Design a protein around this ligand. Structure first.
Ligand SMILES: O=C(c1ccccc1)c1ccc2n1CC[C@H]2C(=O)O
Length: 131
Protein backbone atom coordinates (compact mmCIF):
# COMPACT_ATOMS: atom_id res chain seq x y z
CA UNK A 1 0.00 0.00 0.00
CA UNK A 2 2.42 2.66 -1.23
CA UNK A 3 0.14 4.67 -3.53
CA UNK A 4 -1.31 7.35 -1.25
CA UNK A 5 -0.84 10.76 0.36
CA UNK A 6 2.19 10.79 2.64
CA UNK A 7 2.91 13.41 5.28
CA UNK A 8 6.27 13.30 7.02
CA UNK A 9 6.14 13.63 10.81
CA UNK A 10 9.62 13.71 12.35
CA UNK A 11 13.13 13.63 10.90
CA UNK A 12 16.69 12.87 12.00
CA UNK A 13 19.96 14.30 10.70
CA UNK A 14 17.87 15.83 7.93
CA UNK A 15 19.92 19.01 8.31
CA UNK A 16 22.92 16.73 7.84
CA UNK A 17 21.96 16.35 4.20
CA UNK A 18 21.51 20.11 3.89
CA UNK A 19 25.18 20.63 4.79
CA UNK A 20 27.10 17.71 3.27
CA UNK A 21 24.93 17.89 0.15
CA UNK A 22 24.61 21.67 0.34
CA UNK A 23 20.82 21.81 0.23
CA UNK A 24 19.36 25.32 0.27
CA UNK A 25 17.45 26.41 3.36
CA UNK A 26 14.64 28.30 1.62
CA UNK A 27 13.53 25.09 -0.08
CA UNK A 28 14.45 23.04 2.98
CA UNK A 29 12.25 25.31 5.12
CA UNK A 30 9.17 23.15 4.53
CA UNK A 31 11.03 20.22 2.97
CA UNK A 32 13.03 19.72 6.17
CA UNK A 33 10.25 17.69 7.83
CA UNK A 34 7.90 20.07 9.65
CA UNK A 35 5.86 21.02 6.58
CA UNK A 36 6.80 18.37 4.03
CA UNK A 37 4.28 16.42 1.95
CA UNK A 38 5.44 13.36 0.08
CA UNK A 39 2.88 11.92 -2.36
CA UNK A 40 3.04 8.47 -3.95
CA UNK A 41 1.39 7.57 -7.26
CA UNK A 42 2.85 4.23 -8.33
CA UNK A 43 2.34 3.87 -12.08
CA UNK A 44 3.66 0.69 -13.64
CA UNK A 45 7.45 0.54 -13.32
CA UNK A 46 7.44 4.22 -12.36
CA UNK A 47 6.15 6.06 -9.30
CA UNK A 48 5.00 9.69 -9.35
CA UNK A 49 5.96 11.98 -6.47
CA UNK A 50 3.81 15.02 -5.75
CA UNK A 51 5.20 17.27 -3.03
CA UNK A 52 2.97 19.79 -1.26
CA UNK A 53 4.11 22.80 0.76
CA UNK A 54 2.95 26.17 2.08
CA UNK A 55 4.18 28.33 -0.80
CA UNK A 56 6.89 26.11 -2.31
CA UNK A 57 6.20 23.10 -4.52
CA UNK A 58 8.19 19.98 -5.43
CA UNK A 59 7.78 16.83 -7.52
CA UNK A 60 9.85 13.99 -8.95
CA UNK A 61 8.85 10.94 -11.00
CA UNK A 62 10.38 7.57 -10.11
CA UNK A 63 11.19 4.52 -12.17
CA UNK A 64 12.48 1.17 -10.93
CA UNK A 65 15.81 0.83 -12.71
CA UNK A 66 16.40 4.49 -13.50
CA UNK A 67 18.52 7.31 -12.14
CA UNK A 68 17.20 10.01 -9.80
CA UNK A 69 17.29 13.69 -10.74
CA UNK A 70 17.40 16.71 -8.44
CA UNK A 71 19.81 19.15 -10.09
CA UNK A 72 19.17 22.58 -8.58
CA UNK A 73 21.90 25.23 -8.79
CA UNK A 74 19.76 27.27 -6.40
CA UNK A 75 20.04 24.56 -3.76
CA UNK A 76 21.75 21.29 -4.60
CA UNK A 77 22.09 18.58 -7.25
CA UNK A 78 21.63 14.88 -6.50
CA UNK A 79 21.42 12.02 -9.02
CA UNK A 80 21.10 8.34 -8.12
CA UNK A 81 18.57 5.54 -8.61
CA UNK A 82 15.41 3.94 -7.22
CA UNK A 83 14.37 0.30 -6.93
CA UNK A 84 11.83 -1.73 -4.97
CA UNK A 85 12.44 -5.22 -3.61
CA UNK A 86 9.20 -6.84 -2.53
CA UNK A 87 7.77 -4.57 0.15
CA UNK A 88 10.81 -2.29 0.46
CA UNK A 89 12.13 0.58 -1.66
CA UNK A 90 15.76 1.70 -1.93
CA UNK A 91 16.36 5.10 -3.50
CA UNK A 92 19.72 6.71 -4.19
CA UNK A 93 21.40 9.97 -5.19
CA UNK A 94 24.82 11.35 -6.13
CA UNK A 95 26.26 14.85 -5.76
CA UNK A 96 27.84 16.55 -8.75
CA UNK A 97 30.50 18.12 -6.51
CA UNK A 98 32.54 14.90 -6.55
CA UNK A 99 30.06 12.14 -7.33
CA UNK A 100 29.21 11.51 -3.69
CA UNK A 101 27.15 8.38 -3.05
CA UNK A 102 23.77 8.62 -1.38
CA UNK A 103 21.58 5.75 -0.17
CA UNK A 104 18.03 5.64 1.18
CA UNK A 105 15.99 2.72 2.54
CA UNK A 106 12.30 3.12 3.33
CA UNK A 107 10.69 0.28 5.30
CA UNK A 108 7.11 -0.20 6.49
CA UNK A 109 7.35 -0.08 10.27
CA UNK A 110 3.76 -1.02 10.74
CA UNK A 111 1.28 1.81 10.40
CA UNK A 112 4.24 4.14 9.79
CA UNK A 113 7.38 4.33 7.66
CA UNK A 114 10.95 4.43 8.96
CA UNK A 115 13.28 6.14 6.49
CA UNK A 116 17.07 5.97 6.66
CA UNK A 117 19.27 7.90 4.25
CA UNK A 118 23.05 8.01 3.98
CA UNK A 119 25.46 10.22 2.05
CA UNK A 120 29.23 10.10 2.55
CA UNK A 121 29.45 10.48 6.31
CA UNK A 122 25.93 11.92 6.45
CA UNK A 123 23.19 9.53 7.54
CA UNK A 124 19.73 10.97 8.13
CA UNK A 125 16.65 9.10 9.33
CA UNK A 126 13.01 10.08 9.02
CA UNK A 127 9.86 8.76 10.67
CA UNK A 128 6.74 9.00 8.54
CA UNK A 129 3.00 9.33 9.18
CA UNK A 130 -0.12 9.51 7.04
CA UNK A 131 -2.70 12.28 6.75
O1 LIG B 1 13.45 16.16 -2.52
C1 LIG B 1 14.56 16.38 -2.04
C2 LIG B 1 15.52 17.36 -2.71
C3 LIG B 1 16.89 17.17 -2.66
C4 LIG B 1 17.76 18.06 -3.27
C5 LIG B 1 17.25 19.16 -3.95
C6 LIG B 1 15.88 19.37 -4.01
C7 LIG B 1 15.02 18.47 -3.39
C8 LIG B 1 15.01 15.66 -0.76
C9 LIG B 1 14.99 16.18 0.46
C10 LIG B 1 15.46 15.22 1.32
C11 LIG B 1 15.75 14.14 0.61
N1 LIG B 1 15.48 14.41 -0.69
C12 LIG B 1 15.85 13.24 -1.52
C13 LIG B 1 15.86 12.08 -0.61
C14 LIG B 1 16.26 12.71 0.70
C15 LIG B 1 17.78 12.67 0.91
O2 LIG B 1 18.45 13.57 0.34
O3 LIG B 1 18.24 11.76 1.62
Amino acid sequence: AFDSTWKVDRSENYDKFMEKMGVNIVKRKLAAHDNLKLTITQEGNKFTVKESSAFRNIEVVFELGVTFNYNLADGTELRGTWSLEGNKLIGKFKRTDNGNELNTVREIIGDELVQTYVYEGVEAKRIFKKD
